[model samples]
Every structure is written in C-alpha cells, then in structure tokens.
Target chain A: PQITLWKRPLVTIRIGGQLKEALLDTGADDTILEEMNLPGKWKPKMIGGIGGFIKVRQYDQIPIEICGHKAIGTVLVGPTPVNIIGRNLLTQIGCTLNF
Target chain B: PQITLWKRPLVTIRIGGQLKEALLDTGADDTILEEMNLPGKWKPKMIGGIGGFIKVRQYDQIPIEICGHKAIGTVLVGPTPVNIIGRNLLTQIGCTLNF
Candidate 1:
C-alpha cells in the first residue's frame, strides 16, 4: 500500500502501540517523537534539526507501523514539536520520491 | 526522473538561473532560499519553519527547474540555513511520495 504526499506529507503511524500523526521529513536523519513510554533500554543522545539540537532518549528495536508498513528500528523520544518519520525508518518501508 | 529518498531527500535545482541543492521538505508550505536575488516584485512576508518564523521576500512568476521538472510559482527568500523546496512548488512538479 502507498500514501499520498500532501502539503505536510503527514501519515498515521503507530509507535509503541500508540497512534499519532507523523511528518515524513526527508531532511531528518532519525525518527523523533514526543515524549512517550519506552518499554526497553535507552540511551541519552542529542539530535539536530533545522535550527538547533535537542537532547533525546534513543530507543532501539522499536516497532513502528507507518501507513500500513511495519518496521522495527530506533526511535528517539524528545520534546519534538511534531512527530517526524525520518529516513531511518522510511528506508525500511521502501519510501521513495515519485514524479 | 525518479529519486530515492535517502537520509535526506536532497535534489539539485536551478532557481533564478542559479543552481543549488535544496531539501525536499514536505513539512514546509513555502519554498525558501538563503538570501537570493529576486528578479521581480515581491511582498514582505513572514513564514514559519521547524524552529520559528522568518521574514522573507515572496517572489512570484519565477521559474524553477526542480529535478528537470519545470515549475513557476512563489519562492521565498530569507535567512534560511538551507534551501527548502516546499509544497507550493512541489505540487506543481508532479512530485509524490512513493514506496
């Protein structure tokens, strides 16, 4: 299954068993989500965005269902203004730029 | 031509007769460039990005060659850290998110 890229390229995704809207940002390297419960071990890390960097907790082996595509990878929990589905997880779903 | 969405979906584009690499930011509504010469009349406007708002010159009737796709639309020039290709222009170029 495929999804349409809208003005914001948002998609419904489930992470850690919670559903949320995630922005498909190709500019981001990691999938950053708002503070959430991680059921496993994590490490404190710093990630940068368009303007600045923010400290986040990196959780690995997380399951994410993005627009019906299932993927297991690392997810960063931080004070992100918006949930961003970066290329790290997008690649696993075989997401590409189409014209 | 189609492009793979890498860690960062970057593409070479020509704007205002100059070449530059721009991020295909689906989260953005307006295309923004780092202080560039606008060849036409523009209105002073403010646009917001990931971090905050930015004052920019909104130029219309400008032709942009985005990955060999010809597009003419509004392009914003401001103190952008990186050139971002937004939805206004992306919609006109047959750009879509594929998986």
Candidate 2:
C-alpha cells in the first residue's frame, strides 16, 4: 500500500486484543501508546519528541498486529496525545519511505 | 528513492541558502526548524508533540529546497531538538509511505 502524506499515514493496529488507530511516525524511534495496561512487568523509560522528553513504561517483546502484519518488539506506554507506530516496529513490517 | 525504517530518514535540505539535515517526519503536521533567522515578519503559533505544546514563529510562503526538490510553504522556527521536515514539505516532494 502506498500512503500519501496529504493526510496522516494512519492505520488500524491490533494490540493486546484491542483495535486502535495509530500514525506511522517515521520520525519516532519507538512506538509510544497512550496509557494502557499490558501483560508482564515493565521498566521505566524516557522518550523525547518535538517539545521535550517524558517518562514512560517500557514493555518488551509485546506482540502487535499492524494492519494485520504481525510483529513483536518494545512498546512504550506513555501520555502521548496519539498512538505512534515508529521505526522500531515499522522495520518489522517492511515499511519504507519513498518518493 | 526508497528509505528503510531501520534508521532515521534523515535528508539534506537547503533552506534560505543554508544546507542542514532534517528528519522526514510523517508524524508531524507542520515543519519545524531549530531557532534560526529568516526574512519577513512572522506570527507566534503553538505546536504540540509527545510531551506538550510550545510557542514558535510561523513564517509563510518560505521557499525551501528539500533534497533538491523545490517547494514553498509555511515554516516554523522554535526551540526543537532536531529539524523536522513534516508532511507540509513532504507532500510537495511527493513523498509517500510504501510497504
């Protein structure tokens, strides 16, 4: 699928049996979700963005389905305005930037 | 060109006759650059990211050459960790997400 940048490259993602919309954020290094509960223990982590850095809960080896493509990696649960699918998982699904 | 997500999609962009590196950030709506001097009057605006929103100077109709692709659009100057080439300029260069 080819997604144009005219609008956000938003896609439906299935994580922890919940379906949600997320942006394919090439700028983001790690996937950050809104505060949510996930299985297993998580460690404290910090991430930075346009404004500043913030603390988040890091859950590793979490299974996520991006647009039906299965992937397992680290997921950061934080107080982000929107769910972000970053390069960490984008690489798993073979996503790329083209022009 | 096709860029893999294994690394940050950094590109050289020429703005105001200055060459700088910027991230092709699909997650960002507006292109925001680090505090720099530009021509003409600018209005104060607020932009948000993972943490919070910050005030920036918005300059419109600014001519920028992104990877040698000529484009003219609104540009924001503020205190940002990195220069972000957001959707506003990506669209002008016909950038897209492909998988």
Candidate 3:
C-alpha cells in the first residue's frame, strides 16, 4: 500500500502593523525575520554571501495574525531582498508544514 | 543635498539552540521567523505566494549573538525558507540599518 501527504495552509500576517504575505517552510531550521515592514533603530552585520560572506543587520518586532490568531516576534534589520520564515514560535503549539 | 548611504554589517544568530546565518532587511515593516533548524511541533497556514497561496508552519526560537550581543525573541511559527531580523529589538538600543 502507498500513502500520500497533502500540503497545509499558508497564513498572512501583520508586522509592525503592516500586512505582508509569507509562506511556511518547515524545511528551514530557524525562523528568519525580515526588516522591511518594521519601524525603529537597526544595525547591519556582515557574513558570507553568494560569493563569500556578507554583512547585515535587523530592526523591529511586529504583530502577526493567522487564522484570526495573533502573535508577536522580532524582525531582522537590513537589506533582505527576499524574506524568510523559520521555526521559533511554531513548536509552542503543535503544528506542521508543507512544500 | 548630497548623501551617500553605505550598507551595514550582517550578523549570525542561534535559534532553538542551533546556529544559522541571516541578513538584516530594514525595508521590511515587520519581522519574519523560520521553523527549519529548531526541534519541536508546528502548524501550517495558507497564504498567497508568487504563483498563488500556499500552506506553511514553523517550530522554535533560538538564541542570537551579534558583536558579542545576544537577545531572544519570538520566531514566526512556520516553514520559512529564509530567516529575518527586525525592529522589536533594534529600537531598544538605538541602531540603524543600511541597504
């Protein structure tokens, strides 16, 4: 017998009082916060990049609402061309992810 | 008026007791978290993406250290391919972000 798995639901959230769309990627190890929609003071750090390591930083913490469920978390501060989501808050409640 | 804006430095952090690299994105109004590296339970939510909407969820919150500075924040609970940093924290110390 063979079995198949289905994809879960993606949620939209409001950060820094702003609304942006995101996807749930369980394949990721941690939660990556973006600094685009937040307001406040921030700094950048440098690490390895595509060629090598790069420098970057982050700024604020915004509110999030999903399935009418709301929560808060911190956002990364710097120039993130692409925003990512990780696993810092998910474990709190029992949940799963899909690709 | 003439102004030359320079890019900032990027920092590395540890989430859910795991270490992962990330960049700072200030253009983001809110912070986004990921769920790949940590260990625990998670849930998925459906939101729109490039093609359409998708379902995802995250797992845990890990520790972060920058320039010998460390802090803890709530990670978005879902499957986020990339992790971000935000303002919920930067403002506390009075920092800035560079693209």
Residue-by-residue lDDT tens digits, candidate 2, B1-99? 889989899999998889999999999999999989999999999988887889999999999888788889999999888999999999999999988
Residue-by-residue lDDT tens digits, candidate 3, B36-91: 54456654555332223335453334345533456554444444445555453333
Model with the higher TM-score, candidate 1 or 3: 1
Find the 10 residues in a row with the least total lDDT in model 2 chain A.
Answer: A45-54
- Total backbone collisions for each predicted model: 0, 0, 123
Candidate 3 chain B minimal-lDDT segment of 10 residues: B1-10
For candidate 1, give the DockQ.
Answer: 0.58
Per-model lDDT: 0.81, 0.93, 0.41
Across A1-99, the per-residue lDDT of candidate 2 in tens digits comes to: 889999999999999889999999999999999889999989999898777888999999999999989989999998898999999999999899998
Q: Alpha carbon lDDT of residue A59, candidate 3? A: 45
Reference interface contacts recovered per candidate: 0.59, 0.93, 0.00
Q: Which candidate comes out best when scored by TM-score?
A: 2
| Total residue pair clashes for candidate 1 | 0
Report the lDDT of model 1 for residue B46. Answer: 76
lDDT of 2: 0.93
Chain B TM-score against the true chain B, candidate 1: 0.90
Candidate rank order under TM-score: 2, 1, 3
